[PDB]
């Protein structure tokens, strides 16, 4: 079915490691039979409060479609070792 | 878990064993065994140091790799064998170089695993990689203490540790006894919790199989006449009559602390023990 | 060498505490209702908090101070009767802040009351 995977990236890591994270995350969000709907962003934008004392952060949205059930928990076990995300969320 | 027993005899009345369902390939590997002659407390003078030892059953030491070298080579896991020298079980990994070795086995392990310092090093159960390359809140065991020495802390059955944070040059480890402690940042750590967790409910049930494990009886102090224990005889049974219960060599044993002002342990031990 | 600060007042129904501080919270001077000598049931009297806020004002005007922000909390009286005493002792008060630890539904209250 249709999913959506959102993750707020902490700042000052996408001037040189830009697409050293997101391409590898969308190299693992987009696998196991998944032509995604749309991979886009929302930008380095405003947070409503502080998260690990970050006032801002990158927003990146990946809206992936597949028919395998729990092949996306790799991202839920790659977002822990990667300390380069500050929060995240999957819906549907 | 524990296979119980049925009271056909007064010996087997409440005895409780430990079922061997996590043991594969019960015969050992005849190239990693080294002989192990016993001693009951018999040092290089022949006298008796440490008491209550000796006898039981013959054993044969099985060579364990605590170093975890051979960086960046995929190691399968073949067979999970039994080891009498220690409380955990044991594993027989095969590196792709055909160099069969032994690993102390973590909780769930049959798949195939990796030792590498920082390549990607694949944080899963069974993978060893230094403490600067481990994220926080990660249950580790078999830590080294000195760099390159060999894994020392938390090697028991069902033991564990916990990485808390990262200080200026060290890391910060919570040990199983509840004692926060700084370890140098290039000591390795196996990730996971060591298996065989049902170990301390093995009710021995009988004074005979508590006796062929290498244990001898321990006579209490108040039944020795006062040549040889400070809780000497007196007519009848007797309360101890000291201000403090004493060990058989004079030192008070119930309450008094024993460690001394020691190098490279006062500046590292932040919290003490909790008991 | 201080220009602006914060004037904490905290007046429960059994006491009254004013703690006029610096912006880090460094204690310039504090002036409680027990400090003036209200030993008894006068800490439940709203007159006592009136003069309890003015011992701390001039003790903070000698360190240099113009404009403060006021943080108050109390189930009892004196919660607004004592803030205007900062005006009546020569201190500019503009901002009012009602901090109160209202919980997000946890950690059960004490149950001493037996109806």
């Amino acid at each position: 079915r249709t999913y959506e995977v959102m993750y707020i990236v902490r700042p000052n890591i996408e001037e040189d490691a830009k697409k050293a994270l997101v391409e590898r995350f969308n190299g693992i969000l987009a696998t196991e039979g998944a032509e995604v709907l749309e991979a886009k962003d929302w930008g380095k934008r405003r947070l409503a409060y502080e998260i690990n004392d970050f006032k801002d952060g990158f927003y990146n949205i990946v809206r992936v479609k597949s028919d395998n059930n729990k092949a996306t928990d790799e991202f839920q076990r790659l977002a822990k070792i990667s300390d380069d995300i500050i929060r995240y969320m999957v819906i549907r | 878990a524990i296979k119980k027993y049925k009271p056909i005899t007064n010996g087997r009345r409440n005895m409780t064993s430990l079922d061997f369902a996590e043991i594969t390939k019960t015969t050992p590997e005849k190239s990693l065994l080294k002989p192990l002659p016993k001693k009951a407390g018999r040092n290089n003078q022949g006298k008796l140091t440490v008491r209550h030892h000796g006898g039981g059953h013959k054993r044969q030491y099985r060579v364990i790799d605590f170093k975890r070298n051979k960086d960046g080579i995929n190691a399968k896991v073949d067979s999970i064998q039994y080891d009498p020298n220690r409380s955990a079980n044991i594993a027989l990994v095969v590196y792709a170089d055909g160099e069969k070795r032994y690993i102390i086995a973590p909780k769930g392990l049959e798949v195939g695993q990796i030792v590498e310092s920082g390549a990607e090093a694949d944080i899963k159960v069974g993978n060893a990689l230094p403490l600067q390359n481990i994220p926080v809140g990660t249950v580790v065991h078999n830590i080294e203490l000195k760099p390159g020495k060999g894994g020392q802390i938390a090697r028991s059955a069902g033991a564990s540790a916990q990485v808390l944070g990262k200080e200026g040059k060290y890391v910060l480890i919570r040990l199983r006894s509840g004692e926060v402690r700084m370890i140098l940042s290039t000591c390795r750590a196996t990730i996971g919790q060591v298996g065989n967790l049902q170990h301390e409910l093995v009710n021995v049930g009988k004074a005979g199989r508590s006796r062929w494990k290498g244990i001898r009886p321990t006579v209490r102090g108040s039944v020795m006449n006062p040549n040889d224990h400070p809780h000497g005889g007196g007519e009848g049974r007797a309360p101890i009559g000291r201000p403090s219960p004493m060990s058989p060599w004079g030192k008070p044993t119930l309450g008094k602390k024993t460690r001394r002002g020691k190098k490279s342990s006062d500046k590292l031990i932040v919290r003490g023990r909790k008991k | 060498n201080i220009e602006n600060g914060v004037a904490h007042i905290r007046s429960t129904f059994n006491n009254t505490i004013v703690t006029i501080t610096d912006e880090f919270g460094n204690a310039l001077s504090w002036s409680s209702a027990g400090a003036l000598g209200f030993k008894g049931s006068k800490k439940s009297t709203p007159f006592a908090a009136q003069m309890a806020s003015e011992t701390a004002s001039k003790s903070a005007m000698e360190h240099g101070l113009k404009t403060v922000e006021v943080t108050v909390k109390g189930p009892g009286p004196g919660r607004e009767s004592a803030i205007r005493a900062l005006q009546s002792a020569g201190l500019e008060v503009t901002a009012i802040r009602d901090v109160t630890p209202v919980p997000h539904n946890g950690c059960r209250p004490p149950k001493r009351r037996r109806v």
Binding site: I8, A48, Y49, R87, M89, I91 | - | -
Partner: protein
């Protein structure tokens, strides 16, 4: 657009002093369209799109 949670109309209709949700009586909402607008705020606060306590 009562459905999705990545819009700004959640920010402009339901705040009083702390960010607490206004009731269904005072705003003038429906009942079916309160459940689609309640949990969507609970997902909105978890992704820092709106504050739990705002002042």
């Amino acid at each position: 657009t009562h459905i999705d949670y990545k819009d700004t109309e959640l920010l402009k209709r339901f705040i009083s002093e702390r960010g607490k949700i206004l009731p269904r009586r005072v705003t003038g909402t429906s009942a079916k369209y309160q459940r689609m607008l309640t949990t969507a705020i609970k997902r909105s606060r978890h992704m820092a799109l709106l504050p739990y306590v705002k002042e």
